[PDB]
Design a protein around this ligand. Structure first.
Ligand SMILES: C[C@](O)(CO)[C@H](O)COP(=O)(O)OP(=O)(O)OC[C@H]1O[C@@H](n2ccc(N)nc2=O)[C@H](O)[C@@H]1O
Ligand SMILES: Nc1ncnc2c1ncn2[C@@H]1O[C@H](COP(=O)(O)OP(=O)(O)O)[C@@H](O)[C@H]1O
Ligand SMILES: [Cl-]
Length: 269
């Protein structure tokens, strides 16, 4: 009895870093926005298996790690065969892996009689991925702490958004590790910025991890410069690699993308 579950992406509509935590993580503020861009996940009764169409090893898959932790916490044997069709590229700053982890573990929990509460599930996915708890909420939310302390919000943002995703995979850890004092801001500063974005002022979006990613991976900067040339203000999701803008894709951009190996995703919010 195979089922299909959709695993959506997010973008950050702005991100600010407040400082380092002794744990090695960073305290942040960000506006998360779930976007209609999905991995397709097929769940089948069978021997525990987690496969993708892009060669991610089972042992390194967040979903697999989550299911194995589920088994350990709960005592219940997981007999599900998982295949993920990965439309959302790894290292794109769209939280694809985090989404995968959250929707699979939410579904498997329900299928097995809900041995974990909303809170326990949240803590489980959260202990593996800072972005994963967002995907248990979806829609629009302010993420605080490491990103997992969530406040649902209603924004005045709608219309076309285009994602331009280069082939280069951005390492989240490497981008965060390049942060120094000059990159940090007070929460009061970030908090004012986020509220303006929520009210529709998209010009107020910024993201220091984007600044760093453009330096560490020159192709992200090329995409960024190309979007400017197209007549749009570019923005960066996560720690890169994705650049987005508020508008549609022209034939010129599609041509550039085809030639350069960029993925162009046209969305409506
Ligand atoms: C950049 C964002 O995509 C914005 O939504 C997220 O903060 C990244 O979250 P994620 O992909 O779930 O990241 P994780 O897999 O939990 O952590 C990967 C690495 O990123 C760094 N990291 C992540 C989250 C955070 N609040 N501070 C950090 O410093 C840590 O060095 C960590 O080892
Ligand atoms: N199910 C999964 N989907 C995508 N990436 C995964 C998955 N499981 C593990 N990974 C690993 O996580 C990294 C990218 O994950 P992703 O959530 O796309 O990062 P980000 O969105 O922060 O750029 C890659 O190194 C990849 O090998
Ligand atoms: Cl930005």
């Amino acid at each position: 009895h195979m089922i299909k579950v959709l695993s959506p992406a997010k973008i950050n509509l702005g991100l600010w870093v407040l400082g380092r935590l002794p744990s090695g993580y960073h305290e942040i503020l960000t506006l998360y926005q779930e976007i209609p861009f999905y991995d397709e996940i097929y769940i089948r009764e069978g021997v525990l298996r987690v496969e993708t169409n892009i060669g991610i090893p089972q042992e390194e898959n967040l979903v697999y790690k989550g299911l194995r932790e589920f088994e350990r916490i709960t005592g219940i044997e997981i007999n599900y065969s998982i295949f993920i069709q990965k439309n959302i590229p790894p290292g794109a700053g769209l939280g694809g892996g985090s989404s995968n982890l959250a929707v699979v573990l939410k579904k498997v929990n329900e299928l097995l009689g809900s041995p974990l509460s909303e809170e326990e599930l949240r803590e489980l996915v959260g202990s593996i991925s800072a972005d994963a708890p967002f995907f248990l909420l979806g829609k629009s939310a302010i993420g605080r702490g490491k990103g997992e302390v969530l406040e649902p919000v209603e924004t005045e943002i709608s219309g076309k958004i285009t994602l331009v995703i280069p082939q280069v995979s951005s390492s989240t850890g490497r981008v965060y590790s390049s942060l120094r004092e000059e990159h940090f801001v007070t929460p009061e500063y970030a908090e004012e910025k986020i509220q303006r974005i929520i009210s529709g002022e998209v010009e107020e979006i910024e993201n220091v991890l984007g600044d760093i990613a453009r330096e560490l991976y020159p192709e992200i900067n090329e995409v960024y410069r190309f979007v400017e040339y197209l007549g749009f203000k570019p923005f960066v999701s996560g720690s890169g690699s994705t650049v987005y803008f508020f508008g549609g894709a022209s034939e010129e951009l599609k041509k550039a993308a085809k030639m350069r190996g960029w993925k162009v995703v046209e969305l409506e919010l």
